[PDB]
Design a protein around this motif. Structure first.
Motif, PDB file in Angstrom:
ATOM      1  N   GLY A  15     -19.674   1.290 -17.263  1.00  0.00           N
ATOM      2  CA  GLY A  15     -19.500   0.469 -17.683  1.00  0.00           C
ATOM      3  C   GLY A  15     -21.207  -0.235 -16.713  1.00  0.00           C
ATOM      4  N   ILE A  16     -21.330  -0.798 -15.784  1.00  0.00           N
ATOM      5  CA  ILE A  16     -22.513  -0.959 -14.881  1.00  0.00           C
ATOM      6  C   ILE A  16     -23.001   0.055 -15.013  1.00  0.00           C
ATOM      7  N   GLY A  17     -24.358  -0.195 -15.146  1.00  0.00           N
ATOM      8  CA  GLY A  17     -25.549   0.421 -14.860  1.00  0.00           C
ATOM      9  C   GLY A  17     -25.592   0.769 -13.633  1.00  0.00           C
ATOM     10  N   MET A  18     -26.419   2.028 -13.033  1.00  0.00           N
ATOM     11  CA  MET A  18     -27.621   1.871 -11.285  1.00  0.00           C
ATOM     12  C   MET A  18     -27.667   1.135 -10.646  1.00  0.00           C
ATOM     13  N   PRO A  19     -27.523   0.699  -9.818  1.00  0.00           N
ATOM     14  CA  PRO A  19     -28.349  -0.330  -9.163  1.00  0.00           C
ATOM     15  C   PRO A  19     -30.358  -0.132  -9.386  1.00  0.00           C
ATOM     16  N   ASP A  20     -30.909  -1.271  -9.968  1.00  0.00           N
ATOM     17  CA  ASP A  20     -32.400  -1.062  -9.745  1.00  0.00           C
ATOM     18  C   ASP A  20     -32.947  -1.321  -9.052  1.00  0.00           C
ATOM     19  N   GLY A  21     -33.072   0.083  -8.435  1.00  0.00           N
ATOM     20  CA  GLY A  21     -34.142  -0.847  -6.580  1.00  0.00           C
ATOM     21  C   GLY A  21     -35.639  -1.116  -7.207  1.00  0.00           C
ATOM     22  N   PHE A  22     -36.161  -1.440  -8.044  1.00  0.00           N
ATOM     23  CA  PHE A  22     -37.194  -1.962  -8.427  1.00  0.00           C
ATOM     24  C   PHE A  22     -36.510  -3.551  -7.952  1.00  0.00           C
ATOM     25  N   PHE A  35     -36.754  -3.073   5.049  1.00  0.00           N
ATOM     26  CA  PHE A  35     -36.418  -1.634   5.283  1.00  0.00           C
ATOM     27  C   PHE A  35     -37.450  -0.823   5.206  1.00  0.00           C
ATOM     28  N   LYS A  36     -36.710   0.698   5.384  1.00  0.00           N
ATOM     29  CA  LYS A  36     -37.396   2.173   6.299  1.00  0.00           C
ATOM     30  C   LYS A  36     -37.118   2.919   5.099  1.00  0.00           C
ATOM     31  N   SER A  37     -36.717   3.065   3.958  1.00  0.00           N
ATOM     32  CA  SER A  37     -36.648   3.865   2.824  1.00  0.00           C
ATOM     33  C   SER A  37     -35.718   4.091   2.384  1.00  0.00           C
ATOM     34  N   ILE A  38     -35.399   4.012   0.634  1.00  0.00           N
ATOM     35  CA  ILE A  38     -35.069   3.239  -0.473  1.00  0.00           C
ATOM     36  C   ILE A  38     -34.628   4.809  -1.398  1.00  0.00           C
ATOM     37  N   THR A  39     -33.990   5.202  -0.828  1.00  0.00           N
ATOM     38  CA  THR A  39     -33.437   6.566  -1.752  1.00  0.00           C
ATOM     39  C   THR A  39     -32.008   6.683  -2.932  1.00  0.00           C
ATOM     40  N   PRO A  40     -32.888   6.413  -4.533  1.00  0.00           N
ATOM     41  CA  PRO A  40     -31.541   6.352  -5.585  1.00  0.00           C
ATOM     42  C   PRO A  40     -30.512   7.854  -5.862  1.00  0.00           C
ATOM     43  N   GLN A  41     -30.043   7.302  -6.653  1.00  0.00           N
ATOM     44  CA  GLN A  41     -28.644   8.712  -6.248  1.00  0.00           C
ATOM     45  C   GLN A  41     -28.421   8.742  -7.701  1.00  0.00           C
ATOM     46  N   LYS A  42     -27.427   9.600  -7.883  1.00  0.00           N
ATOM     47  CA  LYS A  42     -27.361   9.743  -9.000  1.00  0.00           C
ATOM     48  C   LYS A  42     -26.681   8.525  -9.714  1.00  0.00           C
ATOM     49  N   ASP A  43     -25.420   8.213  -9.636  1.00  0.00           N
ATOM     50  CA  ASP A  43     -25.149   6.535  -9.016  1.00  0.00           C
ATOM     51  C   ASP A  43     -24.814   5.564  -8.006  1.00  0.00           C
ATOM     52  N   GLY A  44     -25.938   5.391  -7.689  1.00  0.00           N
ATOM     53  CA  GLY A  44     -26.531   4.542  -6.727  1.00  0.00           C
ATOM     54  C   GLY A  44     -27.390   4.472  -6.272  1.00  0.00           C
ATOM     55  N   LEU A  45     -27.539   3.971  -4.983  1.00  0.00           N
ATOM     56  CA  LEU A  45     -29.154   3.566  -4.008  1.00  0.00           C
ATOM     57  C   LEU A  45     -28.921   3.928  -2.533  1.00  0.00           C
TER      58      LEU A  45
ATOM     59  N   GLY B  31     -41.163   7.843 -16.471  1.00  0.00           N
ATOM     60  CA  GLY B  31     -39.918   8.767 -15.766  1.00  0.00           C
ATOM     61  C   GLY B  31     -40.188  10.112 -14.899  1.00  0.00           C
ATOM     62  N   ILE B  32     -40.573   9.371 -13.700  1.00  0.00           N
ATOM     63  CA  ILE B  32     -41.190  10.144 -13.253  1.00  0.00           C
ATOM     64  C   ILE B  32     -39.518  10.037 -11.712  1.00  0.00           C
ATOM     65  N   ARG B  33     -39.248  11.155 -11.004  1.00  0.00           N
ATOM     66  CA  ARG B  33     -37.730  10.802 -10.669  1.00  0.00           C
ATOM     67  C   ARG B  33     -38.700  11.234  -9.128  1.00  0.00           C
ATOM     68  N   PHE B  34     -37.838  10.943  -8.064  1.00  0.00           N
ATOM     69  CA  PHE B  34     -38.728  10.773  -6.938  1.00  0.00           C
ATOM     70  C   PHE B  34     -37.259  11.402  -6.122  1.00  0.00           C
ATOM     71  N   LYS B  35     -37.176  11.767  -4.527  1.00  0.00           N
ATOM     72  CA  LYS B  35     -36.270  11.404  -3.779  1.00  0.00           C
ATOM     73  C   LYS B  35     -36.031  10.343  -2.955  1.00  0.00           C
ATOM     74  N   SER B  36     -37.214   9.794  -2.806  1.00  0.00           N
ATOM     75  CA  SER B  36     -37.092   8.877  -1.717  1.00  0.00           C
ATOM     76  C   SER B  36     -38.323   7.930  -1.383  1.00  0.00           C
ATOM     77  N   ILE B  37     -38.793   5.886  -0.821  1.00  0.00           N
ATOM     78  CA  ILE B  37     -39.857   5.984  -0.768  1.00  0.00           C
ATOM     79  C   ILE B  37     -39.539   5.816   0.489  1.00  0.00           C
ATOM     80  N   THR B  38     -40.941   5.452   0.990  1.00  0.00           N
ATOM     81  CA  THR B  38     -40.408   5.092   2.545  1.00  0.00           C
ATOM     82  C   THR B  38     -41.399   4.788   3.085  1.00  0.00           C
ATOM     83  N   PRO B  39     -41.422   2.978   3.016  1.00  0.00           N
ATOM     84  CA  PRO B  39     -43.247   2.324   3.297  1.00  0.00           C
ATOM     85  C   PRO B  39     -43.356   2.172   4.676  1.00  0.00           C
ATOM     86  N   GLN B  40     -44.715   2.084   4.716  1.00  0.00           N
ATOM     87  CA  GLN B  40     -45.160   2.267   6.393  1.00  0.00           C
ATOM     88  C   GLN B  40     -46.063   0.949   7.018  1.00  0.00           C
TER      89      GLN B  40
END
Lengths: 76, 77
Positions: A15-22, A35-45, B31-40
């Protein structure tokens, strides 16, 4: 050197959508949190930090900023 | 599929970096799927599960950032 930390954001259920990384990115930079990096996942971040201190600061910021229904957990 | 990395850097000292969330916006908008973004410090690295997705992202970001940015696709060993 310091030990990196990971912030995991997931919806509490369906019912709750995946968190938006933007939005997450926006809220972290708006509060000057790096932060060092953001990694999107199927149902998460997953967000990686160079330290547990930055991760914790990001948790209290995203706890207040993110809308209801999100599990925010700091990991090693 | 060998992973691919997209590196975005200013062409020189002076040009800043665009807000990292703008790159995220342009990739999801197309609709581009990426694995990760790493800021430098003076840059951005985007990982892809394939060179095909990386190339699609390069074309998209090339049009979103037509001037002052080096957009290069790099293939992981």
């Amino acid at each position: 050197q310091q030990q990196e930390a990971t912030l995991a954001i997931r919806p509490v259920g369906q019912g709750i959508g995946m968190p938006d990384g933007f939005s997450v990115w926006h809220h972290l930079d708006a509060n000057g949190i790096r932060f060092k990096s953001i990694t999107p996942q199927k149902d998460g971040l997953l967000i990686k930090f160079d330290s547990t201190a930055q991760g914790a600061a990001a948790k209290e910021v995203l706890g207040r900023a993110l809308p209801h229904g999100y599990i925010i957990a700091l990991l090693e």
